[PDB]
Amino acid sequence: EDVRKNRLKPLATYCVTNEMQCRENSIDPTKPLAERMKIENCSIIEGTGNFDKCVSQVESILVAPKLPLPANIEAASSGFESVDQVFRFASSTAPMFITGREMLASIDTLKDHRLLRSDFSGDVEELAEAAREFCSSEVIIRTDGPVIQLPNARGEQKLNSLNFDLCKTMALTVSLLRHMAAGENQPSFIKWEKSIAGPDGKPLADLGWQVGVILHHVLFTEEWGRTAYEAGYSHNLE
Amino acid sequence: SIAGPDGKPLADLGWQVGVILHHVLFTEEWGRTAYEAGYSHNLE
Amino acid sequence: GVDADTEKRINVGKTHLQTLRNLETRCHDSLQALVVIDAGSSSTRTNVFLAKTRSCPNKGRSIDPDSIQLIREGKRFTGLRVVLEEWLDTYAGKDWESRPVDARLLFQYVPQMHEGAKKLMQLLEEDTVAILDSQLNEEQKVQVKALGIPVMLCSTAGVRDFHEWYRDALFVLLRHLINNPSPAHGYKFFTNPFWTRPITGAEEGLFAFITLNHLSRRLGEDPARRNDLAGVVEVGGASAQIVFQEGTVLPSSVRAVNLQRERLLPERYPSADVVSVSFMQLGMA
Amino acid sequence: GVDADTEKRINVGKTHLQTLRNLETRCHDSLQALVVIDAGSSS
Amino acid sequence: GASAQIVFPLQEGTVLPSSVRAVNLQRERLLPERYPSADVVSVSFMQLGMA
């Protein structure tokens, strides 16, 4: 019930057309912080278990919203307001890599339950067929943690703080791949990776912004030599 | 010896100061050999 | 006999000078450590890296890009967002979130923000040294300490700007803590406003693109076709990024991000015009 | 009184950051030694 | 007649929100590097033009 532990806090804090765009997305800036993120006339959330309805909602709210958020144009950003407009005007045939802890887990969970084939092709309908069966699963209270019972005896797994919201990420993967296919140009291959292996067989470093930050300073031979070697640690010395 | 602004000479006459300056004055080359490479160059 | 003794003795003396003359002219390789502090909305953790430096005469010192390898990623400590939030609860009152509080009045509690940042920095220094002492051997430590360790503390998308002065001043204090480390360990940690700086979602996506192409051996000096680079779709905790045909007619409202012009890649590396987009609304939280 | 206490306390905190921001931007002077060995016919 | 323009030198060390961008004359190839660096608030409005 905490204000800091609330997931709507980064959206509530940030919220000419910016004031209008926030209000239409239910985040009224004029309203106080307490009722800004508090859902009006709601007390209980009940799971209906429908993947196709989840996909359409993720599409209408997150992926392709009719009234999107400002999405400002900085020195690093291109300028696109939403995902749907990116693959519509700027689609490329260049290979794609889908990263993210919750994103990778969405594909792995379907693979381990035999619903998704061992060969990771990246076909939207093959991914949607496997997720439709998994997300329509029953929940029963057990002696050693709650279990996710798959329909027509496909399998079972323990329910945790990272497994219940996994189906929303599965809908995000389906919706995002649907926009990639709809565009003029389609990528060479669609792959899911946690880390890229080097020439030795083992990865040198993990995926993220980490290596990019090093390189963008390191690659500039003259500037790196002046700050890291000419000045060095000897700079901050009295 | 030539006296400086304080009244006392900074260094004695000869080739000594000239050898220092002819390496020192070249800002880029001096920074590459004396600071970029430095003493850390001859290290196994 | 006497001829075999004389010819070998001369050869040993000749090869001795040849080896000595080579040491002066040839390039020397030295091991260097690189520290990157991953400061986020959830946690602030250290990342220790290793690289090979090439010391050539009249050319200077440069890091081999392919030699960059991560050794160990540190433990998850309290985020920078919480550090300032606790500073606002104690020195401005819990009402700060809704009730308007003057920023000028909080300028008197600056050394109190320094003490709060000191508490986190000492733990990050302790964790880094623990990795360096356990992962490096004795000969490696001689090269690592003598050169100096550059630190790159970056606060990613998720940490709020606060719209005042709090976050900007905290970074000035953080840099001072890094530039003044414990002399006990011997590891010369240092930084500057260029390395230690707050980063945005769009910037994070661009660095993630440079990382992916470097590890896949795609990003290099020799061009294959504009270099053949692979795109990335990273859906993180706070923000999601999409960074990725040829000479396409693009609208005026949207600009194609050139990594060379934006000072992210040098002129010697092939030109890369990419579509860089970041959305906070698609991030996990 | 309370106004003189608050205004001075803010000023000390403001001048603390001003000095810290200056150290990062301003140039630093360090003493260095240079050795020249005069090798001749006599000594 | 058609459109109104307002171009002026930017305040030294402004807030500069990510919604807007500062137009550098040297970076936009309008002025050479030998001339002093200048960042301006360059805006044009069709709705404010005389006609």
Curated annotation (Swiss-Prot), chain A:
The keyword Secreted applies. One of its GO terms (molecular function) is nucleoside diphosphate phosphatase activity. GO terms for cellular component: membrane; symbiont-containing vacuole. It is found in: Secreted; Parasitophorous vacuole. Keywords: Glycoprotein, Hydrolase, Secreted, Signal. Coiled coil: none annotated. The keyword Secreted applies. Belongs to the GDA1/CD39 NTPase family. May perform an important processing step in the conversion of high energy nucleotides prior to uptake by the parasite. NTPAse-II has a specific activity 4.5-fold lower than NTPAse-I in hydrolysis of ATP. The primary difference between these isozymes lies in their ability to hydrolyze nucleoside triphosphate versus diphosphate substrates. While NTPAse-II hydrolyzes ATP to ADP and ADP to AMP at almost the same rate, NTPAse-I hydrolyzes ADP to AMP at a much slower rate (0.7% of the rate for ATP). Homotetramer. This is Nucleoside-triphosphatase 2. The chain holds residues 382 to 628 of 628 of the full protein.
